[model samples]
Target: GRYYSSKQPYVAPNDATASSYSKAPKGYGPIYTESMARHGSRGLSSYKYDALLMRMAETAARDGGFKSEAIKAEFVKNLSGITAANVENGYGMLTGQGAQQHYGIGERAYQRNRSLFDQAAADGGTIAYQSSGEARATESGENFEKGFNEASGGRLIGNVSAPTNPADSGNGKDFQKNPDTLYFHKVQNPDGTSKVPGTKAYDIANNYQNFVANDATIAGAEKTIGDNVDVKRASHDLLSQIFTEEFLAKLENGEYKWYNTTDGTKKGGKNCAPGADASKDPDACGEVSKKIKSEYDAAMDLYNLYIIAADMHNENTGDHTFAFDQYFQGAYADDARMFAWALDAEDFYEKGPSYAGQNETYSIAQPLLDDFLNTIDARVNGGSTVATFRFAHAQTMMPFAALLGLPGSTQQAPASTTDVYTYGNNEWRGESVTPMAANVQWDVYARKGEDPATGQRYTPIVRMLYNENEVPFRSECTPVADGSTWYKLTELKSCLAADHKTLGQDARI
Candidate 1:
């Protein structure tokens, strides 16, 4: 139950280093490859949990509310060490481990399709790079390229490079920013123009934005939190570990409150850092602002640090390796998982297959699916591009997974405020579904000669790897034959498109 949800460090479901991958069927040989990968493990997206914890701990330290000098010292050391790393790493950017993760993925990708890559290199063809226009995503593509280049002995041509000038975003001969397909939820035209109001892109962007804050749309998530999660129990149990009973009581009784210093939403109103010595004007650094008034929220701040620490475990952050493990282990592990459930519920509502009979959450992924098909078609038509590597976020991965109906991401909760998504009913566990560096890759293979049955060229077959484990397409889509993992690309596409139609969605691209 000690789940980190999506923050779990990556462990390939089936190691590419192993020899369990399915063979492409008789006469079929590898031709092209494509993949959509979520960027690897990263620091917290912002300074919310870490900042608030620092602020709260500062107050408790002064008030002498710590359980012991040793506990207080250890907690402070861990908090400061993690905070410093986030600052140095830059909030939300890839850490050392993240770069390593992508490098390994890229290396494995090359190793898996050596012949195809070698052919592309000999033919003067090239691989393509696309990212969601974020530094992390672009950097991930770079690291992946590095590993791939090293593994292949610099065989494949990686001629395309992202613009060195931040302002230059034109496509063709550029490592493109493909946010429309890769970042549909946070769609950006990138060329700097307003979206036409009624366009598909426009409707998708608008509807996703509305889904984000619409209380009605996310009511099931809210209700799940209020009804199922035992936040106070988890919070009180966690706070008691480091703080004395009296201190915990004080927090419960509202005697202490903490707010964020990293942003104006909490403390430092319109720019103010409380408890700072002005050293000049008396009121210069003093300001009253929003405060963290609940123990549950504060515990959540600490829980975040615990989970993310796993991602950075391999990093060489000097002086302190960050012992967040001591806080969330033993008796407190359950609390961490409970908090993870709350996080998972929100993710399920907004991203993963949400309520039944609704496609709004994942319909926006059509452009990505279309691009996937288009690239494959080009390869089938003798195009020069060898592989298309796309980097994006967990937000991007979840909806895309659902759009393709990948294993755990398939089930949607019944649209009921009373009984909503739960671990009991849904297999959509984030730890498995969209963990750091999560990816879905398709390997295309074509038979060597003409198909005797079709009396024409043999149809290309596609095999899918979700997190490097060969898996079937959605249950409805038939493979090349029974008990075979390979799928006829045409049959796979038609069956999947039929599902879209059944769901009342536009099937064309």
Candidate 2:
């Protein structure tokens, strides 16, 4: 949750050493690669949160309740700047930075698997790209293609899907989007009415929202906003906007100088340091007032604007830059963390590893997993394709991670559990686990080896890369080297079979 804004590539510890990953076990060489990536970083999808925040700032402006007149002036000025950008962009459009993120991933993938892609180009084989058909997804897919093509010196041809074309359906398959998948979970029924009010999905979401609304920490913060405003809506609206380091740094520096240039005296109210001792001096009353009387509501309000600021910056809709600072200062940050956890908890249960007994949440991902495995299987059996890239949302990535039992995705919140999905309880973190442009890759290799009953032959091997870091196959299947990350393709097949049996399903492989 802490790293919600980072979308850069990660280098695993094992891959850090000079000797590490020097070569793929003697004769083995990468032959093919497959990846599924989340869309890149983006602005909050709408201006509704900004609208709410503007209302509060407007009230604060008219009421003159601020401890520092300068701080109040700056607050209103920054709020208006943020509001203007959001109004211009509306919602859900991908930023240029988002396009760059996808492009970077594509460039890196081509560099890392240069030989694999080069061989495909040499053999007249082609690269294939697919996405969920959403604008951002297709844009990401296109950017990835651009990167890969550039990396291959424009030799690698790409068959990119159109934005409206469902990539999953083009391979002569008509599988309906799973009702349990993230898409259908909220859609109107076949009769064009709302889904059943009492469905498990509905209840689970409602219960979690209720738990967050009632959580002492969040509820206490909610009191700062307003008693009647919807906490759940406001929190959800605010969470995405709060993860920026720019906002945190501004808050930490007490730099709410949006309107007040004649600075130092008025900026202290922006500090809102909860523990700054009031007993120490005379002007301490101001600090105390900032902490108790103004901090929470101001923090929440600022966070909403901070989100607007980021979106507006992305949209390039405004001339003046908005104040980006610590909207969640002192004790307010503590409550913000809890609110973030509440949102994380909901994502964890619904899209991530949920409860151990509740298989359906993760099970719905099996079809996609099957597709991944089957694609590799086909290539191993001499299929024509060289590489496959898939772009989708966090919903697709999280469940797939759970289905693969990726580290940090194995532990599950106990069934019927509420307010217990803390960081101490599980490793699932929405920010790190499925941040924008997050990806998982399967790199296939082959080497000459004895085939037991048969003579020496080429044996296939595989490595799993989650977000550019090498991760071992589920621990049960031993790697080829004593402590190495590489594993035999045969063992991987068996591991998936075992996983299927564990899940009480027949192994399709």
Candidate 3:
């Protein structure tokens, strides 16, 4: 939740807590593996959000609508800096921290599954990389390679295959979309005549509308902001500016706390104002003798007003720009929960498992799943590839997780009479299900085998890891050696084959 808030560093779950790698049942060693990861932390997807923020800030400054000059000045200054950086970086690109995330994951994966890469290198194999063809995805893939290479001592894993050129690979067939069957957010008809409802995009947009309609905080903000401005745009900017100012305030105060950069520089520090006892109140600002509580409250109110405004912007755009809305605290947490309900409702119904009977939202991921299995199939069947990595967005990862029936991805999200999924009705959370750097890995292991014709051979098994946590395939799939996380290749293939057939039948229906 905080990860999307754009406020704090998202601490990764512990390896042990997430789930440990089960020992490959005796004699088996990892031979090949594949992983799909969401692009790391990214900036706002488009410049429009920041553009609108700048416009509103300038207008507010000129109109003198800001309540606190101090807060207002800080807001404008930070917005100016962020916008300037955005101009140079463009929107939706990875941050330096994001690159670090990819590199760290690559290095970690190598450390955990050294045998797989080492065997590939020993066999004169190549590490294959594929991505969504966007700059962020490609950069993420390259960074992963950089880490992998560094972990492998450079020469051992020397050959890195160049990313596929879309023009030459038929747009990497498995990754390409069939316009007719394609359905996601804002899906249009094949002829571009109209939107296709019941799609992920449609559901998300619909749920967002429901959130705005029912949310008291949003309603109150809109009432206060009045209709004089673009409520959505202005609110989003206000919250973003508030967040940035808070970050800077904490940074300037030397209370740094957010995730450190590659070189170990902290961005935000302690929450409170300077000279305050850390124990008395961590977020305290000013001296106990100076009587600044009232002043602090006033400043906080101004900060909150902006936050409420920006929250409206998020509500309107249905795109995340800030981490958590300030108003989501106290009795307002209920409001926050519901707001999250609306947001997560869209995620659960559209990208996740969807309502009890609504499987089509997830069905679209079949080809990607098929590609994952097929690629592993080819490698285990004697293809020379060592490892395969696919980098894409959370949209891709969500449905793919549903297709696999992974935990938190196999639940219902029934809509209320209001046509929105009620809050607290399910377990799917965007933070847990599709956090930045979210990933799923399949490790192919082999054991020495005695063959009648050949003197000796290798028998293969597969284990699945979702977001670094061991997860079993669907129950219908056969299991081996206790079935916690390991699945026999034959059983997995059979299960997937049967599931694929059923999926096709469902498609026709």
Candidate 4:
């Protein structure tokens, strides 16, 4: 007892596994039989190698069984392998034998992006949902009035406003009932429950509400059917940076069976492969965008770069002040104006007028969003229809461009941390929401003049079906509390005459 030695209890392997790992699997293989191939007593050298290989083959026999078990576990049996202890042991041996591999460290890169996405979902889906509106002139944007000129049929001649294409006649009374209503307008569901908030069913019901609210009646209007409409809209919010990061991590980790540049924001031109030489042009660009062109042309790039920078800052110093020096340049700037790009954006109609605040800035940072919207439109319209021409970019770039006196052909510059404007949310004005109904009265009724025919009304329908004069008319209307219909229109007409002032008494138009 007094002579007990710490190292004498057990003998370690006489040789490493790589040195000589051959051993019968403790009565686990085909019984060590007499080899008829070349069995003699000289310790079976070459045949032993063959036996080793056979041992390997036998060792892996449980592999297919394990694989079958894994499949059984994953799909058929839900990953359970009650009768396959060998499979479980085999998997454990394989995993443990491999070098310590950081399979999920790659996931850390996308943590912020995933977080951002989850937050976006929460923010976007917070409301049950309401209505939305989109207007398009029947013609290919050829009307005399910029928007009106696009109307298909003759301009509002006398009391009747019809499409140039009898087939496009909004009434469906002419052209084989193939109406091409010059200015096709639709409404979105007012309640979140109608159809899926943003689906066709929701829109059809909303469209009727719009016509009833603005045009005043369902008469003469196309019997907006569920088949022709699309109201299914998801909650409003941009993709979170965290989601993008995780998605990118998966791509980086080669977790996907197949992958492409579109899979994430790693940038196709960068270098990330092993044996990559930077002198010869490394495959991975350490920074998000080594230069501006890579990340500046589209809004998503900027958003991605921003996320990277913000995360970097948040991590290295535990304070949000870092930048993606590896992939992008510039540090995080919370007050940046690019964030205001969507200031003027009108999300779900039920949420009500995306009020135009004096301090609210706007811009278009995400071209991908545009592409997505257009893709859906192009599919349905067979690539013939055009989406809105004026964009948030123009609205966003205008004042700054003018302030800088930049050339008209300046094009978009590289994205930077510098902000261009100050945009405020609806909360800034001490108001939670402008109220959809109120927004309608101020925006649509003022410009559209209550559909002169039906007297039906709603803000979204009026704006969606707006003619050139409508924008100004709506711009003029102020929120006044009076049931008197005529008075509201009167206020709207007055504002239109003022040449649509920018701000102040003519604050927003």
Candidate 5:
């Protein structure tokens, strides 16, 4: 017998639904020859359907590589075929399906050969396990030893999971967690690009191309911070989220004083504010508004700092682009502020935005950003300086944004599309799945519209409230007293008034 050759021909079907294996009636057996392997053929047709994406991915990898045209096309085909668009994004579908197919195929191949190994091995064979501990730089002395010296069967050596290469820091962590290992795979490169995990040259190229090609709707607090840094970017965003939840939780927990957003809906008590006005801009939702506003006040200083930082980033990048104006309206764009969290050094250089050092003294309406914005706007309007000062660094801006309720702003939005009215014609936008925060940009004319000293709101804002159903406004229309019902507008006002910064006699950034 030829050991490598199959006596039975492998059945290949053109149609996905067609089974590769044939079944006979209860009485007949000569029609088809039975094979020793039975479990291998169960639901073969379904398996084909499942493995289709894997084949596509393998082909894609062979030709165009990950995130290439071939991969994208294959992904689109599979997702559409499965009618899975409603559940997952194009990228998600492609990566997920492709990985699944690869894993399944690998498992099958392993199983077929592994059975031979099992049959050849002894019955109660020498099962072996090993562990070893050694003093190294990364891990604490005790935990490192415990983790290392805990093996069940045989050979044990070195710190638990970490290899003893001195070049690699043995961060005594679980498998594949250290940024060096899990994130970047401990790979080094002559080019600095490889240092940032998940941001390889290939990945960067692919992602940038994806954005350009698909014109995917991108928004959220985290996204707004750009891809320059990593997580916990904007501390203000975190503070904002914490404040929002704190207020809501306080309300739920009967901390009545903090319960200022819309009142919680308890029978006749209150209603979750209706979803953002579908008819208006930003579609201000009642429940969301309360949360946004509560966090806004709690983190006003943070937002104010963010405004300043935006100005700095814009000027530094040779663009007068303000972050708020650039990202005000989009699904979850506000959430991306997490990436803009303040750094440790504030006002290290005196020439930069004033808010950088101002936060050290200010703790008003919200985080430092909001507070600075509110204060500067008032001062600018009050004739404090000839020109508005518009800038701060991340360290100052991020903390301030935190007071505005941005923590956990990373949650996915209800929809996927957003209006792209770059010209500010509020009436131009029609219905889109993207979140309003993701799509809206500030009117460039408003760049010089705040106070020089405080960097607060200007009276004649380029962006105004559009009452008509055809035009959308970012903030809410309802009263702040409504609690969970009013959302952004009411909450912003409440936070501003309550968290208003009193000019300290010696205030200077």
Candidate 6:
């Protein structure tokens, strides 16, 4: 139920509309906008999740696991059809719905700051775009451009790529490939190749993987999901949708299991452990060791498909029928509360605020935050960029949100062994922290005059938008006025300077 997309389709996290956005602090006007956005909803990144579910379904089928012939047949039909749809969609590309989300976001941004872009269009100024070099992020950037340029009547067309400064013309108008700033997580190319194997970006990505995968590092998140017992029990009950209690008993007791395989079609299930005796029951074996490799993996696989199905609704067409609701209905359905919690627990530990005193998990985003500041400075100090948009992923957005201490991303779990993150104990949830097409934007405005002391242009004020909704920065940051979301650029920098200082000193890493 806490799943934001569960009951209602995503509409930009309650969309603080153009009208609702605060007017500039008297006499000031928007000069530029900078934002980093997660790529919109996408299809299965590969032939993986769906394949795993199909494998599990077949495994149960061989074990006579069906509770009813009718439901089992229904499940198989849906699974095969969804897989086929994914195959047709070409794996990780954005769905029609995905493209629309970015298009609307771009359209709205232009509508909200018409003057800034309008001025750019009149004076030959350029807007900049950046991407992580991954295909999804690049495509989202393209889609956003389509919407923005389309809305502006093509007058501001193709004013593409920019370095720190666009009008300087040294950097052409092609989307800049900046993985370190946007895709710091993996620093990989769209072709699945690493960006630079021997750089700081790769170093951070390597350490991050360790932080999430190693038992020593992931203990905080992993402990939160140790309800393997609960997950298994829930698995048993939920799988009853199509599986007989007898078959559930076999999986629960670990009597019928397999080592699983890379190829779900791998015969005998990669090192199949077929039931009480392999010789007596040769049929019960076919699966991929789901990341969740236990009695409940099948149930978890279904749960995974169910959640992603919400995003894929845009692509669910004529033959690609995916009705996952039937499995989660009534008492037989909606163990999603538990599944979602387990998912949130991992994100909180690995990406969002982790144990209260730790910063490494989030501070890996320092380069990103620096670029955000650099962009505003570029505009305020004689740069000709009107907007800079960067398209990325949850891996980048989550840590950056945690680093900036955005709402639903501020609180960190205590380091106590028994007091790790939980829904009751923590406010963090995946929906708010990093939903599909999530974004954080900063709009900068400046007055018509120059600052007396610095001899530079007037100090600009900046406002932040998370998913198009205005929100205050962290408590440590004080806005220009009480209850105001706007903060003077100088004041905001001073606050973050202290943060970087502390982060530098928090070398307890």
Which is the better candidate, 1 or 6, if ranked by lDDT? 1
Q: Over 4 Å off in model 2, which ranges?
A: 1-22, 67-69, 87-90, 158-318, 329-335, 416-419, 448-459, 497-509
Residues 381-470, candidate 2: write the lDDT tens digits. 878777778877777787788878887788887543333456677888765677667888888888645655546555577788787767
Residues 1-509, candidate 4, lDDT per residue (tens digit)? 11101101111123342133222112112100000000000101111111121222232233332234432232212101111211222211112101011111112111212332233234331101001111111111111112221231222222122323332324221211111110112221111112445654345344534533442111111121111111101000121111243433332344422111222234443322223233442222133232211111122223333332221221233222222222222222221223222221111111111112211111111122233233333423332211122211111222222212122211222122121111232221101111000010111122322544445631111121111011222323442322211212233334323253222332222
lDDT of each: 0.76, 0.55, 0.53, 0.21, 0.24, 0.71
Better of 3 and 5 by TM-score: 3
Q: Write one digit per residue (lDDT tens) for candidate 3, span 1-509.
A: 22132112224548664445678877777778888887776654433323333434454455554556775666655444443443334445666666777887787778778877776677787777776555566666668767877887875446555543331243232232222212222244222344357755456435544543574433342233232233323333434333344433433354432121211123322222223343543222211221111212222223333332332232222222332244344544433333344345546654677655545566666666777778777887778877777777677778777877778776665433333344345567776777767888888888766745546664477888877777778766656644447676666666665353222221110
Better of 4 and 5 by TM-score: 4
List ranges where model 1 is wrong by over 4 Å. Answer: 13-17, 158-174, 188-199, 215-217, 226-229, 262-267, 270-291, 498-509
Clashes of each: 1, 5, 14, 72, 118, 3
| TM-score of structure candidate 6 | 0.87
Number of the top TM-score candidate: 1
Candidate 6 ranges beyond 4 A from true positions: 2-9, 13-16, 162-173, 191-198, 215-217, 259-293, 331-334, 452-457, 498-509
Candidate 1 vs candidate 3: the lDDT winner is: 1
Displacement of residue 89 (Cα, Å) in model 6 is: 0.4
**Residue 375, candidate 3: C-alpha displacement in angstroms:** 1.2
TM-score of 1: 0.88
Tell me the tens digit of each residue's lDDT in model 5 across 39-134: 010011111121222332333334443434643554434323222211121111112222222223223222222322232232221111111111
- RMSD (Cα, Å) of model 2: 12.3
Q: How does each model score on TM-score?
A: 0.88, 0.68, 0.65, 0.19, 0.17, 0.87
lDDT of 6 by residue, 213-259 (tens): 66454584576465556655777777776878887777667665443
Tell me the TM-score of model 3: 0.65
Any residue pairs clashing in model 2, and if so which? 247-325, 250-325, 250-326, 251-325, 251-326
lDDT of 1 by residue, 1-509 (tens): 56788998778545544367788777788888999998888876655676677777877788888899999998988887876666556666788788888999998999889898888877766687887777777777778888998999886645443444332343222457777777777645544444567877777888888866674747755665744547788888888889888877888898777765444235354322233233432222323343567777778778888888887776535795688878787879888877887788888888889888778887778888889999999989988787898888888889888888999988998877657787888999889889999998999998877756667788888988988888888877666766778877777667677353221122111
Model 5 deviation from the true structure expressed as Cα RMSD, one decimal place: 32.5
